[PDB]
């Protein structure tokens, strides 16, 4: 695999925290997301996750 291009790609989908790349919330939560579970309904508040 292209070690340089893949690094140019990871920045688009993940961010490094404590030496490890954490997936970006905005790709993990498409823009039409909502509280899905059997609990409180809520809008797309990725604010808290960030």
């Amino acid at each position: 695999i292209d070690s340089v291009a893949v690094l140019r790609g990871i920045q688009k989908v993940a961010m490094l925290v404590q030496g490890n790349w954490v997936v970006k919330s905005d790709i993990l939560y498409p823009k039409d997301s909502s509280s899905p579970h059997s609990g409180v309904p809520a809008e797309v508040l990725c604010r808290g996750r960030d």
């Binding site: 920045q11 961010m15 490094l16 030496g19 604010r47 960030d50």
Partner: peptide, 28 residues
């Protein structure tokens, strides 16, 4: 050991993102 790979500019970019989102979250 991500620092073993020579690209220290990445941490600065992540910190710029951190500062931006901090500026967004501090409005609470």
């Amino acid at each position: 050991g991500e620092f073993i790979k020579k690209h220290p500019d990445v941490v600065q970019r992540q910190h710029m993102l951190w500062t931006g989102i901090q500026a967004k979250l501090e409005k609470v």
